Structures are given as structure tokens and as C-alpha cells.
Amino acid sequence: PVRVLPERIHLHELDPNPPGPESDYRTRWEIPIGLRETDLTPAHCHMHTNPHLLIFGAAKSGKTTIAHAIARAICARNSPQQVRFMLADYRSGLLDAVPDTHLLGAGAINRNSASLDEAVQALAVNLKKRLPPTDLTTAQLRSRSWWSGFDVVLLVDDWHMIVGAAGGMPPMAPLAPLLPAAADIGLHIIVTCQMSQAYKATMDKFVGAAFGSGAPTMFLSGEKQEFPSSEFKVKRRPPGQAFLVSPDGKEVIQAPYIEPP
Amino acid sequence: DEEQQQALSSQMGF
Ligand SMILES: Nc1ncnc2c1ncn2[C@@H]1O[C@H](COP(=O)(O)OP(=O)(O)OP(=O)(O)O)[C@@H](O)[C@H]1O
Ligand SMILES: [Mg+2]
């Protein structure tokens, strides 16, 4: 029981020299999300290939702060012509997470069911036009040459609350048909959820679509019965400490901290 | 109310 991870590592210490918008697409979407316990190196989301990130945690385990930090890491690497953000943030805890330059030109800040439903519907209209022509080869698919512009990051905090306040259409329904092609259309969802509701979320048509197709999942503090798993290690942890699960492996990390606005 | 339905999606900068 020697303690290898810091209790707090600032984003700037985790990511002191981020590459900038002049780098290629793959470099710009290798996003650091925490410090590895095994060798004290940064763990990365490979978002040029695996587009999403899921963040599950008990109350005050760091969900919103970590979402804020990872958003800033993405903006350090990408110009407004390379990424735009749409926020679902009913508690308004992420309003300054993204510089204004990097917000989507309209529908960017959604703090209730009515606004989010309108914004997501409009986003789906635009993203649907990026679906690839059926005859594209794998090489053409990977080149993403048939559309041009920014990737979109759909930054979603407190998904359990969004689902809980959902009046009418289940939230994100216009995007559900587009999720299988998310990598091809430049869509990234980064979603936090309270752990007491994350297990059921992994079966739904938004968080559960991403989870079921192998999105990296960060398990912050939680109780064992909230996410039954013999493979994952869900237990109480200090804020920011997480069991990260991805198709590449399973490992304990310390997720980046950033000061609140 | 045709221009109206696309008044949001047409202004997102795509
Ligand atoms: N990456 C981190 N590393 C260490 N400590 C952190 C980290 N992120 C947050 N904290 C600490 O945890 C506290 C709560 O963090 P935060 O509000 O982001 O968690 P939360 O899970 O979003 O809380 P809530 O349950 O209110 O939504 C912060 O005041 C901060 O001190
Ligand atoms: Mg929070």
C-alpha cells in the first residue's frame, strides 16, 4: 500500500507542452486524461479513432472538474476551425469550461430539456449531411475528405439529471441514428454520470451506445454495488482517482485537476 | 415556417 499517484495533478502539470493546431489530426486528438499509476505516464484518449469518453463518479468525485480539464486539453490542440463544443450543463457548472471562440456558433449552451432538445435536433441535421457516401473505400473513409470543417465535442455533465428531467422525447434521440458513424462525422461525446445511475445508463441509447461499442470509461469513486463487475474495480476513492477501462486495458489513473471559474 | 424550422441548424457554422 505505497501511494504512487498524487492526490492532485493540475492539467498544466499533466499536459505541460501540448501540440497545437498546426499538428496533424491524430496528434491533435491524442487527448491526455490522467496520470497512470503503473508508470507515472499520461494516459490518452485516442479520439482520432475511438471518439468518446465516459466519466462515472459518486457525488463530488471530480466529474465536472475533469470534464472541464479535458475540454481545455482539446482546445489547446485544436483551433475553432478544428473543434466546436456543444454543452449540456443543467447545473451551469461548465459555462467557462471552453473559451467562447470554441463554442458552436449556435445552440452551444443548453441548461434545460427544452433548449437541449432544440439544439441536439439542429446538430443532428448538420451531422447527418456528413454521413459518408456508401461507395467510399476504407482508405477514403479514414481520410474524412468528403466533408470539411470542425469536429464537434458534445460535452455533457450530469447525464442522470438530463435523463431524469427528460420531458417528452428521450434526450439525444436525434443523434442515436448517427452514433454508429460518429468517428466518420467528427462527433465526440464526453459524458459524466453519477455512479448510482451509471450502470443503468450503460444500457441506454446514448451513454450505453458509446459504452457498448468500447468507449473508454473512467470509474471514479463509487460503491461496489452501484456498478457490479468482476473485471472492473469500483470502490471508494479520493477525488480524481479512477479505474480507467478501455479496449487497450484496465489501469488506475489520477485525472487532471483545474481551478473552477 | 420552413425557413423557421432550419433557423437554428443553418446558423451553427458548418
Ligand atoms: N481531478 C481532480 N483531482 C483531485 N481533486 C479533484 C479533481 N477534480 C475535483 N477535485 C476535488 O473534488 C471537489 C468536487 O469536484 P467536482 O465538483 O468536479 O466533482 P463532481 O463529481 O462534479 O461533484 P457534484 O457531485 O457536485 O457534481 C472539488 O472541490 C475539488 O476539490
Ligand atoms: Mg458536478
Residue numbers in the entry:
A (entry chain A): 320 to 580
B (entry chain B): 87 to 100
Show the paper's wording.
EccC, the motor subunit of T7SS, is essential to assemble a stable membrane complex for the secretion process. It contains a two-pass transmembrane domain, an unknown function domain (DUF), and three Fts-SpoIIIE-like ATPase domains (ATPase1, ATPase2, and ATPase3). In this study, we have provided high-resolution crystal structures of ATPase3 domains of EccC proteins from Mtb, all in complex with ATP.
To determine how MtEsxB is recognized by MtEccCb1-ATPase3, a structure of the complex was determined at 1.98 Å resolution. Most importantly, it is the side chains of Met98 and Phe100 in MtEsxB that insert into the recognition pocket of ATPase3, which is located in the gap between ɑ2 and β4. Met98 is surrounded by Leu423, Ala425 and Leu442. Superposition of the MtEsxB bound and free MtEccCb1-ATPase3 structures showed that the bulge loop moves by ~3.5 Å to allow Gly424 and Ala425 to form interactions with MtEsxB. Thus, the shift of bulge loop could further strengthen substrate binding. A previous report showed that Asp87 in the conserved Yxxx[D/E] motif of MtEsxB is required for secretion, however this residue makes no interactions with MtEccCb1-ATPase3 in our structure.
